[PDB]
Every structure is written in structure tokens, then in C-alpha cells.
Amino acid sequence: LSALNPELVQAVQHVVIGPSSLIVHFNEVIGRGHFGCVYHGTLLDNDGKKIHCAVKSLNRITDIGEVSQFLTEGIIMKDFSHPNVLSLLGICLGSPLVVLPYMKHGDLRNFIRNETHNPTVKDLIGFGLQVAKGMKYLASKKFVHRDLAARNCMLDEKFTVKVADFGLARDMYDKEYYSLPVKWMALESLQTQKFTTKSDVWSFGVLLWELMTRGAPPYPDVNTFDITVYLLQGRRLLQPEYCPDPLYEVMLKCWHPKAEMRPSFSELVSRISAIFSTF
Ligand SMILES: Fc1cccc(Cc2c[nH]c3ncc(-c4cnn(C5CCNCC5)c4)cc23)c1
């Protein structure tokens, strides 16, 4: 730790959580191992208020070169703050730690799939509008997500959706064993391996479809290899049973073959809030 550049150490100070500010409960995992080694933690603020948090041990980082790089992704993610984006509470310098807020209802996909939960069409559209608000913010900062899907959004105790699985919160589903999300990808990303805000808009379209079907898998009868030819033929996901026609018009616009013809996230927020307001 002494070996790190002093000007870089000074730069990351605002992101660092001191060991006397955090109680990590290494004896209790969050979400029955489905999110890897994520533990409950208690973070103390400047006034001593207790904050329930989720603590991820970043096992991939070993050498000083990697520590220095992760320190930069921390500085960048710390500047990202919005009600519909998962915030980075801080980092701890064994393994470096990533401290994230605790999300009572886990991931959005599992929540909408759970038989015991009964969100209305309005509630589902509200979740979609929340995701659109989070993405409008990321897009405003020229940040391209590359893996937007319902499994990658989280829900807190107030049912606020937080876009996640980006920056230091990426590989959210990395499970350890002892022995590309092509169905959410824009046609041009499948052909070029390049990603833009316009390819996030296509992905948002599929997540909208996921919300309106209460988490059904997209294109269940189509192989990942066959998705390109299927999309090139002009075939698209069909209108869900309980989905308003203007909302399906929105989804279809997200899947337009010409990237420039797709709505921006600011247009999606405008259009979806107008639809939400009719309920
Ligand atoms: F972008 C990320 C990067 C790394 C990790 C993570 C995961 C993560 C962060 N904060 C969390 N806070 C709570 C839960 C969680 C899991 N399951 N549950 C409930 C669900 C209802 N049943 C009881 C358990 C709550 C998971 C997380 C995200």
C-alpha cells in the first residue's frame, strides 16, 4: 500500500472508507450465494448514523498495478449519483473491498417473477420509467452501460429501481465453482462488437418487454447464434398480453435497425412518463 503514487492516493481519499468506519459481517452472505461473495456490512457516517450496506471482496485484484487501476474506476463511479442508479458508497484498501447500498428486494427480474408479488401494469411501467431516468442520467455523462437487462437492476425498500451492474458493481453474478447477453444486444452490436448509447436504447426496449411479461425470457425458441438472421429478417419480440399499444410503439422504436432512428433516453423518459400519467 506504501508503494502507491502519493498524488493518486490524495485523489482517491474522498472514495476511501477507513477500517474504523465499516463493520463487515464476513459470516453472513447476502442472497444465498447468487451474487458471489457479497456480505452484510454496517457503515458509519460522519455523524455516526448506521448504514446497512453490501460488501464485495474484489478477489480479481492482486498486484499494485491492478490496485492503482481499480482506484481510478472508484474515483469515476463515485461522481455518478442519481436516484435511479446504484451508488458506490466507497472502497476499502487482504483483497480490496467495494461498498454498495443494501437493496432489500434484490434484483428487479426476480422480484417481478416471484409468484407472491402482484405489481400492476402501472407499477410495471413505473419501474420502466425509473430505469429510463437512470439511463438518461448515464447517457448525459456519455456512459455506455453495455449490459442493461432486468436482472441487472435492483430494488430497494421503497421500491426504487437502481440501474446496476456497471463500473465497480460489474460481474454482479460472478459465482465461484469447485470443479455476451446476445438476446438484449442491438443488431449492430451483434455485427460489430461495438456499443453506444443507441445500443443501450435497444437493450432498454428488451427490458421493457421483460417488465411487461413479468420476467419471461426473450426469444425462447431462437438460438443465440440465430438471433442475427432473425433480427435481419425484421422479426421482433411480440406485443405482451398486458401491454398498452403506445408502450409497444415505444419498444418497437427501440428496436429500429438504424441506430439514429431510435429514441434518446430523454425522449423515452418523456414518452413513458406521458403513458404512465394516463393510468
Ligand atoms: F451491482 C452489484 C454488484 C455487486 C453486488 C450486487 C448485489 C447487491 C448489492 N447490494 C445488494 N443489496 C441486497 C441484495 C440482495 C440479494 N437478495 N436480496 C433479498 C431479495 C429478497 N429475498 C431475500 C434476499 C437482497 C443484493 C445486493 C450488485
From Swiss-Prot:
Q: Which residues of the full protein are shown?
A: 1055 to 1344 of 1390
Every Protein kinase domain range: 24-279
> Which protein family is named in the record?
Belongs to the protein kinase superfamily. Tyr protein kinase family.
Name the record gives this protein: Hepatocyte growth factor receptor
Question: Which gene is the coding source of this polypeptide chain?
Answer: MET
Phenotypic consequence of H40R:
In RCCP; causes malignant transformation in cell lines
Compartment(s) = Membrane
> Which domain of life does the UniProt lineage start with?
Eukaryota
Disorder cited: Activation of MET after rearrangement with the TPR gene produces an oncogenic protein. Defects in MET may be associated with gastric cancer.
Region Interaction with MUC20: list its residue ranges: 255-279
Chain sites annotated for binding ATP: I30, G31, R32, G33, H34, F35, G36, C37, V38, K56
Show the segment(s) annotated as Interaction with RANBP9.
155-279
Residues carrying Phosphotyrosine: Y173, Y177, Y178
